[PDB]
């Protein structure tokens, strides 16, 4: 029993999106589906439901006239369409299963899709520049890391020394710069005594541009 | 619309202790027809979908451990964890499914631990980056608790505003601390007109604010 959704979609400002929700392990027609969206770091917002059997829908008033919800039982999929996208539509779109239609009693949402991360942006796919955060000429423990700058879209993954170094690692959530590109830092704390001795490499992976960068971080 | 409000926004609890989240609805969600509250609680971990814990005010879903229980009727509900476990750190949401629109509130639950001062580090821009016309200065606050910290940037002792951005890890699984990264972005031309680059930190664990700084030219 599950709901399958694609990981991510990137759309342009002013464009339309179509987010699918493919049902598994039960009869598509017998349950209501709901769409619930979550902007980065914020709450859950209910958008609407659809009874896939009949195509009858109900939307929250604030989404009336820019959304539709449709169903194609031949592929066991239901779709959220929304027009006039803006930066405020950047969010994860979850589909969820509610009420069993033959009985029609209002029900909580027992099964959720993993969600589709929708980014509204006119930026182009770009691999990151990786800059060293050199350990300072003082210290006990030293801090060093990697600055992963100017990539689009999310996500990037970071590892240290090909996964051998995990203790004292902090990979931060990315921030969106006014340029429309993302930036994040990965740092680790290491013994000062090991700086002249031990090699430190951050392994960066940005799947969308197929970019891998290994950056050696040494004292300056 | 039925407006849902959770109390508190943020809850810190020691492992093994009782945690309780409150929700209030602006109208009753108790149906006269069956005497049922059309009220649910959801758990959401960082990067995952919500998970239904409790429906009908108090009915646990299959596999939800019995340390979780729900209570209330009409407009006033609690979610209670009898004994907080590490796996229970999450954001908890209420929802009414009494009438459309089927509204949510929002509530953040963390492990409480002793106050820990941040270790502070500052990183000048790399030569690599300067060659491309931009200068990022990074300030790192490592392994502090609680989560609230203030980073202030200063450039030749002038207070910076609007030209930095920060982000904060999830609670560390081994020591229950947070870390924080702040980036100050200038043009290389602007970076090269100043001497003193300073990261100033204010935190409950510190007796006074901690500053780390460098002179441009290393």
């Amino acid at each position: 029993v599950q709901l399958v959704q694609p990981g991510a979609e990137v759309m342009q400002p002013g464009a339309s999106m179509k987010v699918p929700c493919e049902t598994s392990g039960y009869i598509f027609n017998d349950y209501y589906l709901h769409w619930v969206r979550q902007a980065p770091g914020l709450g859950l917002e209910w958008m609407g439901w659809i009874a896939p059997k009949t195509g009858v829908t109900k939307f929250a008033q604030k989404f009336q006239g820019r959304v539709n919800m449709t169903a194609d039982s031949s592929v066991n999929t239901s779709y959220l369409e929304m027009t006039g996208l803006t930066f405020d539509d950047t969010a994860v779109y979850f589909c969820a299963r509610g009420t069993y239609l033959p009985v029609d009693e209002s029900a909580a949402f027992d099964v959720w899709g993993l969600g589709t991360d929708v980014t509204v942006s006119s930026a182009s796919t770009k691999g990151p520049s990786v800059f060293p955060l050199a350990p300072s000429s003082k210290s006990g423990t030293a801090a060093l890391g990697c600055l992963v700058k100017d990539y689009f879209p999310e996500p990037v993954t970071v590892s240290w020394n090909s996964g051998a170094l995990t203790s004292g690692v902090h990979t931060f959530p990315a921030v969106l710069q006014s340029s429309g590109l993302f930036s994040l830092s990965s740092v680790v704390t290491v013994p000062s005594s090991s700086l002249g001795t031990q090699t430190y490499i951050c392994n960066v992976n940005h799947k969308p541009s197929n970019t891998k960068v290994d950056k050696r971080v040494e004292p300056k | 619309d039925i407006e849902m409000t959770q109390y508190p926004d943020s809850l810190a609890v020691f492992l093994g202790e009782r945690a309780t989240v409150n929700c209030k609805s602006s109208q009753s969600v108790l149906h006269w027809g069956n005497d049922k509250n059309y009220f649910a609680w959801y758990q959401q971990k960082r990067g995952q979908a919500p998970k239904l814990l409790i429906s009908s005010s108090s009915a646990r879903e299959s596999g939800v451990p019995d340390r979780f229980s729900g209570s209330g009727s009409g407009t006033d509900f609690n979610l209670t964890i009898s004994s907080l476990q590490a796996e229970d750190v999450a954001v908890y949401f209420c929802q009414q499914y009494y009438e459309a629109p089927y509204t949510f509130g929002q509530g953040t639950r963390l492990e409480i631990k002793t106050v820990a001062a941040p270790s502070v580090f500052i990183f000048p821009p790399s030569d690599e980056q300067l060659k491309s016309g931009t200068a990022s200065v990074v300030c790192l606050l490592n392994n502090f608790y609680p989560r609230e910290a203030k980073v202030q940037w200063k450039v030749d002792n002038a207070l910076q505003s609007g030209n930095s951005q920060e982000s904060v890890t999830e609670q560390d699984s081994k020591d229950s601390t947070y870390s924080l990264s702040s980036t100050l972005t200038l043009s290389k031309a602007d970076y090269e007109k100043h001497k003193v680059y300073a990261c100033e930190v204010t935190h409950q664990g510190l007796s006074s604010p901690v500053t780390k700084s460098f002179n441009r030219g290393c």
Binding site: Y32, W49, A51, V56, G98, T99, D104, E105, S106, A107 | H31, G33, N34, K36, Y38, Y97, Y98, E99
Partner: peptide
């Protein structure tokens, strides 16, 4: 009047 709250009401 319904014994239950009905989604399509």
């Amino acid at each position: 009047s319904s014994a239950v709250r009905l989604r399509s009401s």
